[PDB]
Amino acid sequence: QVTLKESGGGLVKPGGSLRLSCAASGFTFSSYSMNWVRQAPGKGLEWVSSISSSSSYIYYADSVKGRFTISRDNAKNSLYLQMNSLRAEDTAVYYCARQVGATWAFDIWGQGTLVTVSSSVLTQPPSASGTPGQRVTISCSGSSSNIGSNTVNWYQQLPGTAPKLLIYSNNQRPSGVPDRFSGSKSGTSASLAISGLQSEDEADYYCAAWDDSLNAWVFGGGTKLTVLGAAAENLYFQ
């Protein structure tokens, strides 16, 4: 059973500190780069930090540089995030995610831990909709330094759950993702097409790519896909 389990969240006053932990089980933890990704309510996924398998290479989002420190203890199968100078804007569910070596896709996500602090470079449409059976395509616009230099990943987030990897390496599907989902990339843009739309596809979809100029991951703001009513099969005139 390959799992990630976060802990350490809670209610903290602005300016306070908190240390998060993420316990890995069911795989060789020391073989993988690891990430922290957070999300505020009704907002998009925001990448926070990553650390290489042997800790040599660390990266931070500009929003947290100097305040947060990532670390790991391979002997304890644990990832950590020491958070200092917390602000209301840091309130979010914090997820840890495992990164695949060859593709950089975040293939396993934890369940999240809630941090409450109280007393997007990629462009995606905020909304998309279709009726069951229609094909819906959503785009993700970037630039030379991100989509123009690296592969695109897509994540599906069913309402109130952790994201899951949907597409990696621009157009590849992990096991379990149906062939109704397909990814494409052209120039500095990418798209996700969902053929034969089903009610179960109602979710938020996020594109992500590494940005060579920022030395950080960039996530799109997310597209909320609504699956509308089936639409009249039978009409009547009198």
PDB file of all heavy atoms in Angstrom, residues 142-177:
ATOM      1  N   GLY A 142       1.099  29.004 -21.412  1.00  0.00           N
ATOM      2  CA  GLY A 142       2.321  29.329 -20.693  1.00  0.00           C
ATOM      3  C   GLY A 142       3.258  30.177 -21.525  1.00  0.00           C
ATOM      4  O   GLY A 142       2.816  30.969 -22.380  1.00  0.00           O
ATOM      5  N   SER A 143       4.539  29.982 -21.293  1.00  0.00           N
ATOM      6  CA  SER A 143       5.582  30.751 -21.965  1.00  0.00           C
ATOM      7  C   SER A 143       6.777  29.886 -22.262  1.00  0.00           C
ATOM      8  O   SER A 143       6.837  28.705 -21.919  1.00  0.00           O
ATOM      9  CB  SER A 143       5.991  31.961 -21.125  1.00  0.00           C
ATOM     10  OG  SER A 143       6.714  31.519 -19.990  1.00  0.00           O
ATOM     11  N   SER A 144       7.774  30.501 -22.922  1.00  0.00           N
ATOM     12  CA  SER A 144       9.001  29.815 -23.309  1.00  0.00           C
ATOM     13  C   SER A 144       9.705  29.090 -22.156  1.00  0.00           C
ATOM     14  O   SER A 144      10.225  27.991 -22.355  1.00  0.00           O
ATOM     15  CB  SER A 144       9.974  30.798 -23.959  1.00  0.00           C
ATOM     16  OG  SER A 144       9.363  31.485 -25.037  1.00  0.00           O
ATOM     17  N   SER A 145       9.710  29.698 -20.967  1.00  0.00           N
ATOM     18  CA  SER A 145      10.434  29.128 -19.819  1.00  0.00           C
ATOM     19  C   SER A 145       9.759  27.953 -19.122  1.00  0.00           C
ATOM     20  O   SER A 145      10.427  27.268 -18.340  1.00  0.00           O
ATOM     21  CB  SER A 145      10.743  30.218 -18.802  1.00  0.00           C
ATOM     22  OG  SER A 145       9.538  30.798 -18.332  1.00  0.00           O
ATOM     23  N   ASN A 146       8.445  27.757 -19.343  1.00  0.00           N
ATOM     24  CA  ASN A 146       7.747  26.671 -18.662  1.00  0.00           C
ATOM     25  C   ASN A 146       7.262  25.658 -19.684  1.00  0.00           C
ATOM     26  O   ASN A 146       8.038  24.779 -20.011  1.00  0.00           O
ATOM     27  CB  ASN A 146       6.667  27.165 -17.674  1.00  0.00           C
ATOM     28  CG  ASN A 146       5.817  28.277 -18.212  1.00  0.00           C
ATOM     29  OD1 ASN A 146       5.108  28.107 -19.191  1.00  0.00           O
ATOM     30  ND2 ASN A 146       5.843  29.428 -17.565  1.00  0.00           N
ATOM     31  N   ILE A 147       6.052  25.808 -20.264  1.00  0.00           N
ATOM     32  CA  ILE A 147       5.572  24.850 -21.271  1.00  0.00           C
ATOM     33  C   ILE A 147       6.512  24.779 -22.503  1.00  0.00           C
ATOM     34  O   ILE A 147       6.683  23.700 -23.069  1.00  0.00           O
ATOM     35  CB  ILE A 147       4.108  25.170 -21.653  1.00  0.00           C
ATOM     36  CG1 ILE A 147       3.201  25.036 -20.391  1.00  0.00           C
ATOM     37  CG2 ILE A 147       3.598  24.260 -22.782  1.00  0.00           C
ATOM     38  CD1 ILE A 147       1.716  25.422 -20.621  1.00  0.00           C
ATOM     39  N   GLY A 148       7.159  25.885 -22.839  1.00  0.00           N
ATOM     40  CA  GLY A 148       8.090  25.889 -23.964  1.00  0.00           C
ATOM     41  C   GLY A 148       9.411  25.177 -23.693  1.00  0.00           C
ATOM     42  O   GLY A 148      10.212  24.948 -24.606  1.00  0.00           O
ATOM     43  N   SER A 149       9.685  24.838 -22.440  1.00  0.00           N
ATOM     44  CA  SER A 149      10.951  24.181 -22.105  1.00  0.00           C
ATOM     45  C   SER A 149      10.766  22.811 -21.482  1.00  0.00           C
ATOM     46  O   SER A 149      11.731  22.045 -21.393  1.00  0.00           O
ATOM     47  CB  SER A 149      11.766  25.051 -21.148  1.00  0.00           C
ATOM     48  OG  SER A 149      12.245  26.244 -21.750  1.00  0.00           O
ATOM     49  N   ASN A 150       9.561  22.529 -20.963  1.00  0.00           N
ATOM     50  CA  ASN A 150       9.342  21.304 -20.206  1.00  0.00           C
ATOM     51  C   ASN A 150       8.001  20.649 -20.518  1.00  0.00           C
ATOM     52  O   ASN A 150       7.152  21.254 -21.161  1.00  0.00           O
ATOM     53  CB  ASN A 150       9.376  21.662 -18.713  1.00  0.00           C
ATOM     54  CG  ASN A 150      10.739  22.144 -18.246  1.00  0.00           C
ATOM     55  OD1 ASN A 150      11.692  21.371 -18.196  1.00  0.00           O
ATOM     56  ND2 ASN A 150      10.846  23.416 -17.890  1.00  0.00           N
ATOM     57  N   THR A 151       7.798  19.425 -20.018  1.00  0.00           N
ATOM     58  CA  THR A 151       6.562  18.691 -20.224  1.00  0.00           C
ATOM     59  C   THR A 151       5.462  19.204 -19.287  1.00  0.00           C
ATOM     60  O   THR A 151       5.738  19.850 -18.261  1.00  0.00           O
ATOM     61  CB  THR A 151       6.755  17.190 -20.116  1.00  0.00           C
ATOM     62  OG1 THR A 151       7.233  16.903 -18.814  1.00  0.00           O
ATOM     63  CG2 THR A 151       7.720  16.615 -21.189  1.00  0.00           C
ATOM     64  N   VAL A 152       4.224  18.949 -19.696  1.00  0.00           N
ATOM     65  CA  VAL A 152       3.035  19.370 -18.952  1.00  0.00           C
ATOM     66  C   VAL A 152       2.400  18.170 -18.259  1.00  0.00           C
ATOM     67  O   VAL A 152       2.309  17.072 -18.803  1.00  0.00           O
ATOM     68  CB  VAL A 152       2.038  20.067 -19.907  1.00  0.00           C
ATOM     69  CG1 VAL A 152       0.772  20.525 -19.170  1.00  0.00           C
ATOM     70  CG2 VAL A 152       2.729  21.252 -20.575  1.00  0.00           C
ATOM     71  N   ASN A 153       1.968  18.417 -17.007  1.00  0.00           N
ATOM     72  CA  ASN A 153       1.243  17.430 -16.209  1.00  0.00           C
ATOM     73  C   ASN A 153      -0.144  17.979 -15.961  1.00  0.00           C
ATOM     74  O   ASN A 153      -0.292  19.178 -15.794  1.00  0.00           O
ATOM     75  CB  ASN A 153       1.920  17.251 -14.857  1.00  0.00           C
ATOM     76  CG  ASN A 153       3.372  16.876 -14.994  1.00  0.00           C
ATOM     77  OD1 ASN A 153       3.687  15.712 -15.061  1.00  0.00           O
ATOM     78  ND2 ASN A 153       4.287  17.873 -15.046  1.00  0.00           N
ATOM     79  N   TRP A 154      -1.138  17.104 -15.846  1.00  0.00           N
ATOM     80  CA  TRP A 154      -2.490  17.510 -15.464  1.00  0.00           C
ATOM     81  C   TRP A 154      -2.880  16.743 -14.215  1.00  0.00           C
ATOM     82  O   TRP A 154      -2.612  15.540 -14.148  1.00  0.00           O
ATOM     83  CB  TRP A 154      -3.518  17.238 -16.577  1.00  0.00           C
ATOM     84  CG  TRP A 154      -3.317  18.092 -17.796  1.00  0.00           C
ATOM     85  CD1 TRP A 154      -2.426  17.878 -18.818  1.00  0.00           C
ATOM     86  CD2 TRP A 154      -3.974  19.341 -18.083  1.00  0.00           C
ATOM     87  NE1 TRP A 154      -2.537  18.894 -19.758  1.00  0.00           N
ATOM     88  CE2 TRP A 154      -3.476  19.800 -19.329  1.00  0.00           C
ATOM     89  CE3 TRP A 154      -5.001  20.073 -17.459  1.00  0.00           C
ATOM     90  CZ2 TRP A 154      -3.945  20.978 -19.933  1.00  0.00           C
ATOM     91  CZ3 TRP A 154      -5.459  21.241 -18.052  1.00  0.00           C
ATOM     92  CH2 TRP A 154      -4.940  21.677 -19.281  1.00  0.00           C
ATOM     93  N   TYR A 155      -3.602  17.400 -13.339  1.00  0.00           N
ATOM     94  CA  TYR A 155      -4.130  16.816 -12.104  1.00  0.00           C
ATOM     95  C   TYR A 155      -5.630  17.017 -12.064  1.00  0.00           C
ATOM     96  O   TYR A 155      -6.118  18.086 -12.427  1.00  0.00           O
ATOM     97  CB  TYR A 155      -3.503  17.491 -10.872  1.00  0.00           C
ATOM     98  CG  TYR A 155      -2.016  17.274 -10.872  1.00  0.00           C
ATOM     99  CD1 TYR A 155      -1.153  18.211 -11.450  1.00  0.00           C
ATOM    100  CD2 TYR A 155      -1.476  16.054 -10.469  1.00  0.00           C
ATOM    101  CE1 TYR A 155       0.218  17.975 -11.538  1.00  0.00           C
ATOM    102  CE2 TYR A 155      -0.107  15.811 -10.543  1.00  0.00           C
ATOM    103  CZ  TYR A 155       0.733  16.758 -11.112  1.00  0.00           C
ATOM    104  OH  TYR A 155       2.073  16.474 -11.241  1.00  0.00           O
ATOM    105  N   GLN A 156      -6.358  15.971 -11.659  1.00  0.00           N
ATOM    106  CA  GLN A 156      -7.806  16.006 -11.482  1.00  0.00           C
ATOM    107  C   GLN A 156      -8.082  16.054  -9.985  1.00  0.00           C
ATOM    108  O   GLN A 156      -7.533  15.236  -9.229  1.00  0.00           O
ATOM    109  CB  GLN A 156      -8.463  14.740 -12.087  1.00  0.00           C
ATOM    110  CG  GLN A 156      -9.969  14.647 -11.883  1.00  0.00           C
ATOM    111  CD  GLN A 156     -10.471  13.292 -12.355  1.00  0.00           C
ATOM    112  OE1 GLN A 156      -9.996  12.241 -11.894  1.00  0.00           O
ATOM    113  NE2 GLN A 156     -11.441  13.285 -13.287  1.00  0.00           N
ATOM    114  N   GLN A 157      -8.909  17.002  -9.560  1.00  0.00           N
ATOM    115  CA  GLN A 157      -9.254  17.065  -8.139  1.00  0.00           C
ATOM    116  C   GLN A 157     -10.775  17.004  -8.011  1.00  0.00           C
ATOM    117  O   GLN A 157     -11.499  17.974  -8.279  1.00  0.00           O
ATOM    118  CB  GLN A 157      -8.713  18.337  -7.521  1.00  0.00           C
ATOM    119  CG  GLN A 157      -9.029  18.414  -6.026  1.00  0.00           C
ATOM    120  CD  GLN A 157      -8.435  19.643  -5.406  1.00  0.00           C
ATOM    121  OE1 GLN A 157      -8.399  20.718  -6.005  1.00  0.00           O
ATOM    122  NE2 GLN A 157      -8.012  19.515  -4.138  1.00  0.00           N
ATOM    123  N   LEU A 158     -11.258  15.819  -7.605  1.00  0.00           N
ATOM    124  CA  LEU A 158     -12.676  15.652  -7.330  1.00  0.00           C
ATOM    125  C   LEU A 158     -12.994  16.534  -6.093  1.00  0.00           C
ATOM    126  O   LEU A 158     -12.116  16.766  -5.251  1.00  0.00           O
ATOM    127  CB  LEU A 158     -13.000  14.160  -7.073  1.00  0.00           C
ATOM    128  CG  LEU A 158     -12.555  13.168  -8.202  1.00  0.00           C
ATOM    129  CD1 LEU A 158     -13.045  11.758  -7.906  1.00  0.00           C
ATOM    130  CD2 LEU A 158     -13.062  13.604  -9.587  1.00  0.00           C
ATOM    131  N   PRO A 159     -14.213  17.082  -6.018  1.00  0.00           N
ATOM    132  CA  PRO A 159     -14.517  18.047  -4.952  1.00  0.00           C
ATOM    133  C   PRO A 159     -14.242  17.509  -3.561  1.00  0.00           C
ATOM    134  O   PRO A 159     -14.672  16.392  -3.269  1.00  0.00           O
ATOM    135  CB  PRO A 159     -16.017  18.323  -5.110  1.00  0.00           C
ATOM    136  CG  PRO A 159     -16.344  17.920  -6.491  1.00  0.00           C
ATOM    137  CD  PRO A 159     -15.339  16.932  -6.968  1.00  0.00           C
ATOM    138  N   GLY A 160     -13.511  18.276  -2.764  1.00  0.00           N
ATOM    139  CA  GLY A 160     -13.234  17.919  -1.377  1.00  0.00           C
ATOM    140  C   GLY A 160     -12.271  16.770  -1.175  1.00  0.00           C
ATOM    141  O   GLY A 160     -12.269  16.188  -0.095  1.00  0.00           O
ATOM    142  N   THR A 161     -11.432  16.434  -2.186  1.00  0.00           N
ATOM    143  CA  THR A 161     -10.443  15.353  -2.079  1.00  0.00           C
ATOM    144  C   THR A 161      -9.083  15.861  -2.541  1.00  0.00           C
ATOM    145  O   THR A 161      -9.013  16.934  -3.108  1.00  0.00           O
ATOM    146  CB  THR A 161     -10.810  14.166  -2.971  1.00  0.00           C
ATOM    147  OG1 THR A 161     -10.626  14.505  -4.332  1.00  0.00           O
ATOM    148  CG2 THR A 161     -12.218  13.638  -2.734  1.00  0.00           C
ATOM    149  N   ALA A 162      -8.023  15.096  -2.303  1.00  0.00           N
ATOM    150  CA  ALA A 162      -6.693  15.437  -2.787  1.00  0.00           C
ATOM    151  C   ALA A 162      -6.661  15.281  -4.319  1.00  0.00           C
ATOM    152  O   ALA A 162      -7.366  14.450  -4.871  1.00  0.00           O
ATOM    153  CB  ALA A 162      -5.676  14.471  -2.186  1.00  0.00           C
ATOM    154  N   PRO A 163      -5.779  16.029  -4.998  1.00  0.00           N
ATOM    155  CA  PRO A 163      -5.602  15.838  -6.437  1.00  0.00           C
ATOM    156  C   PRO A 163      -5.039  14.453  -6.732  1.00  0.00           C
ATOM    157  O   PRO A 163      -4.449  13.794  -5.870  1.00  0.00           O
ATOM    158  CB  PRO A 163      -4.547  16.890  -6.796  1.00  0.00           C
ATOM    159  CG  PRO A 163      -4.634  17.921  -5.723  1.00  0.00           C
ATOM    160  CD  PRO A 163      -4.913  17.105  -4.489  1.00  0.00           C
ATOM    161  N   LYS A 164      -5.243  14.011  -7.990  1.00  0.00           N
ATOM    162  CA  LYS A 164      -4.615  12.796  -8.476  1.00  0.00           C
ATOM    163  C   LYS A 164      -3.976  13.116  -9.828  1.00  0.00           C
ATOM    164  O   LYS A 164      -4.457  13.982 -10.568  1.00  0.00           O
ATOM    165  CB  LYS A 164      -5.593  11.615  -8.591  1.00  0.00           C
ATOM    166  CG  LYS A 164      -6.543  11.732  -9.772  1.00  0.00           C
ATOM    167  CD  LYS A 164      -7.295  10.403 -10.089  1.00  0.00           C
ATOM    168  CE  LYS A 164      -6.505   9.458 -10.963  1.00  0.00           C
ATOM    169  NZ  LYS A 164      -7.339   8.307 -11.432  1.00  0.00           N
ATOM    170  N   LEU A 165      -2.908  12.383 -10.149  1.00  0.00           N
ATOM    171  CA  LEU A 165      -2.231  12.569 -11.426  1.00  0.00           C
ATOM    172  C   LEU A 165      -3.160  12.043 -12.518  1.00  0.00           C
ATOM    173  O   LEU A 165      -3.643  10.907 -12.429  1.00  0.00           O
ATOM    174  CB  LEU A 165      -0.925  11.794 -11.438  1.00  0.00           C
ATOM    175  CG  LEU A 165      -0.152  11.875 -12.769  1.00  0.00           C
ATOM    176  CD1 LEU A 165       0.251  13.311 -13.105  1.00  0.00           C
ATOM    177  CD2 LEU A 165       1.086  10.943 -12.719  1.00  0.00           C
ATOM    178  N   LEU A 166      -3.381  12.867 -13.563  1.00  0.00           N
ATOM    179  CA  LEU A 166      -4.286  12.520 -14.667  1.00  0.00           C
ATOM    180  C   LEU A 166      -3.516  12.289 -15.971  1.00  0.00           C
ATOM    181  O   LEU A 166      -3.781  11.324 -16.683  1.00  0.00           O
ATOM    182  CB  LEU A 166      -5.308  13.652 -14.841  1.00  0.00           C
ATOM    183  CG  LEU A 166      -6.440  13.361 -15.826  1.00  0.00           C
ATOM    184  CD1 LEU A 166      -7.469  12.420 -15.208  1.00  0.00           C
ATOM    185  CD2 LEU A 166      -7.150  14.645 -16.232  1.00  0.00           C
ATOM    186  N   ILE A 167      -2.571  13.177 -16.267  1.00  0.00           N
ATOM    187  CA  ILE A 167      -1.724  13.105 -17.465  1.00  0.00           C
ATOM    188  C   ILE A 167      -0.313  13.491 -17.064  1.00  0.00           C
ATOM    189  O   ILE A 167      -0.129  14.489 -16.358  1.00  0.00           O
ATOM    190  CB  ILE A 167      -2.227  14.124 -18.539  1.00  0.00           C
ATOM    191  CG1 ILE A 167      -3.646  13.810 -19.039  1.00  0.00           C
ATOM    192  CG2 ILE A 167      -1.242  14.258 -19.755  1.00  0.00           C
ATOM    193  CD1 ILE A 167      -3.839  12.514 -19.897  1.00  0.00           C
ATOM    194  N   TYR A 168       0.693  12.770 -17.614  1.00  0.00           N
ATOM    195  CA  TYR A 168       2.083  13.157 -17.456  1.00  0.00           C
ATOM    196  C   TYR A 168       2.776  13.195 -18.810  1.00  0.00           C
ATOM    197  O   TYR A 168       2.223  12.681 -19.781  1.00  0.00           O
ATOM    198  CB  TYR A 168       2.850  12.263 -16.477  1.00  0.00           C
ATOM    199  CG  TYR A 168       2.984  10.823 -16.906  1.00  0.00           C
ATOM    200  CD1 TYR A 168       4.122  10.379 -17.573  1.00  0.00           C
ATOM    201  CD2 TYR A 168       1.989   9.894 -16.616  1.00  0.00           C
ATOM    202  CE1 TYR A 168       4.248   9.051 -17.978  1.00  0.00           C
ATOM    203  CE2 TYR A 168       2.110   8.554 -17.003  1.00  0.00           C
ATOM    204  CZ  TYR A 168       3.236   8.149 -17.699  1.00  0.00           C
ATOM    205  OH  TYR A 168       3.367   6.846 -18.115  1.00  0.00           O
ATOM    206  N   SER A 169       3.951  13.841 -18.860  1.00  0.00           N
ATOM    207  CA  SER A 169       4.744  13.920 -20.097  1.00  0.00           C
ATOM    208  C   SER A 169       3.892  14.354 -21.275  1.00  0.00           C
ATOM    209  O   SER A 169       3.961  13.761 -22.360  1.00  0.00           O
ATOM    210  CB  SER A 169       5.447  12.595 -20.380  1.00  0.00           C
ATOM    211  OG  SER A 169       6.330  12.273 -19.314  1.00  0.00           O
ATOM    212  N   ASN A 170       3.075  15.402 -21.046  1.00  0.00           N
ATOM    213  CA  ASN A 170       2.166  16.008 -22.041  1.00  0.00           C
ATOM    214  C   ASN A 170       0.958  15.173 -22.415  1.00  0.00           C
ATOM    215  O   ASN A 170      -0.119  15.733 -22.535  1.00  0.00           O
ATOM    216  CB  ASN A 170       2.862  16.361 -23.371  1.00  0.00           C
ATOM    217  CG  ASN A 170       4.085  17.173 -23.201  1.00  0.00           C
ATOM    218  OD1 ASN A 170       4.130  18.088 -22.384  1.00  0.00           O
ATOM    219  ND2 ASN A 170       5.111  16.876 -24.024  1.00  0.00           N
ATOM    220  N   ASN A 171       1.138  13.853 -22.667  1.00  0.00           N
ATOM    221  CA  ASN A 171       0.036  13.060 -23.207  1.00  0.00           C
ATOM    222  C   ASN A 171      -0.060  11.608 -22.727  1.00  0.00           C
ATOM    223  O   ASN A 171      -0.749  10.797 -23.360  1.00  0.00           O
ATOM    224  CB  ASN A 171       0.168  13.064 -24.753  1.00  0.00           C
ATOM    225  CG  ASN A 171       1.433  12.396 -25.263  1.00  0.00           C
ATOM    226  OD1 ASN A 171       2.331  11.986 -24.508  1.00  0.00           O
ATOM    227  ND2 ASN A 171       1.534  12.270 -26.583  1.00  0.00           N
ATOM    228  N   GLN A 172       0.623  11.272 -21.623  1.00  0.00           N
ATOM    229  CA  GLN A 172       0.605   9.895 -21.139  1.00  0.00           C
ATOM    230  C   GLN A 172      -0.366   9.730 -19.977  1.00  0.00           C
ATOM    231  O   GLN A 172      -0.430  10.596 -19.117  1.00  0.00           O
ATOM    232  CB  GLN A 172       2.008   9.478 -20.697  1.00  0.00           C
ATOM    233  CG  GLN A 172       3.099   9.618 -21.791  1.00  0.00           C
ATOM    234  CD  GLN A 172       2.905   8.608 -22.882  1.00  0.00           C
ATOM    235  OE1 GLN A 172       3.043   7.405 -22.662  1.00  0.00           O
ATOM    236  NE2 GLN A 172       2.578   9.082 -24.077  1.00  0.00           N
ATOM    237  N   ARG A 173      -1.093   8.605 -19.939  1.00  0.00           N
ATOM    238  CA  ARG A 173      -2.033   8.341 -18.862  1.00  0.00           C
ATOM    239  C   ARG A 173      -1.465   7.344 -17.891  1.00  0.00           C
ATOM    240  O   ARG A 173      -1.026   6.264 -18.310  1.00  0.00           O
ATOM    241  CB  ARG A 173      -3.345   7.764 -19.390  1.00  0.00           C
ATOM    242  CG  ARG A 173      -4.226   8.770 -20.088  1.00  0.00           C
ATOM    243  CD  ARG A 173      -5.448   8.114 -20.654  1.00  0.00           C
ATOM    244  NE  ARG A 173      -5.102   7.285 -21.806  1.00  0.00           N
ATOM    245  CZ  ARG A 173      -5.173   5.958 -21.825  1.00  0.00           C
ATOM    246  NH1 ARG A 173      -5.627   5.292 -20.768  1.00  0.00           N
ATOM    247  NH2 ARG A 173      -4.834   5.287 -22.920  1.00  0.00           N
ATOM    248  N   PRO A 174      -1.536   7.636 -16.581  1.00  0.00           N
ATOM    249  CA  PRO A 174      -1.154   6.612 -15.587  1.00  0.00           C
ATOM    250  C   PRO A 174      -2.182   5.466 -15.619  1.00  0.00           C
ATOM    251  O   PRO A 174      -3.301   5.661 -16.132  1.00  0.00           O
ATOM    252  CB  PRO A 174      -1.294   7.335 -14.244  1.00  0.00           C
ATOM    253  CG  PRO A 174      -1.600   8.744 -14.547  1.00  0.00           C
ATOM    254  CD  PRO A 174      -2.025   8.875 -15.947  1.00  0.00           C
ATOM    255  N   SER A 175      -1.844   4.293 -15.012  1.00  0.00           N
ATOM    256  CA  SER A 175      -2.804   3.184 -14.930  1.00  0.00           C
ATOM    257  C   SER A 175      -4.024   3.670 -14.153  1.00  0.00           C
ATOM    258  O   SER A 175      -3.878   4.381 -13.157  1.00  0.00           O
ATOM    259  CB  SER A 175      -2.206   1.985 -14.188  1.00  0.00           C
ATOM    260  OG  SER A 175      -0.895   1.672 -14.629  1.00  0.00           O
ATOM    261  N   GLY A 176      -5.201   3.300 -14.624  1.00  0.00           N
ATOM    262  CA  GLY A 176      -6.452   3.663 -13.968  1.00  0.00           C
ATOM    263  C   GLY A 176      -7.146   4.870 -14.572  1.00  0.00           C
ATOM    264  O   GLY A 176      -8.343   5.071 -14.327  1.00  0.00           O
ATOM    265  N   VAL A 177      -6.408   5.698 -15.368  1.00  0.00           N
ATOM    266  CA  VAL A 177      -7.013   6.866 -16.023  1.00  0.00           C
ATOM    267  C   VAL A 177      -7.575   6.395 -17.370  1.00  0.00           C
ATOM    268  O   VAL A 177      -6.826   5.863 -18.187  1.00  0.00           O
ATOM    269  CB  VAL A 177      -6.031   8.070 -16.175  1.00  0.00           C
ATOM    270  CG1 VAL A 177      -6.665   9.209 -16.973  1.00  0.00           C
ATOM    271  CG2 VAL A 177      -5.573   8.580 -14.808  1.00  0.00           C
TER     272      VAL A 177
END
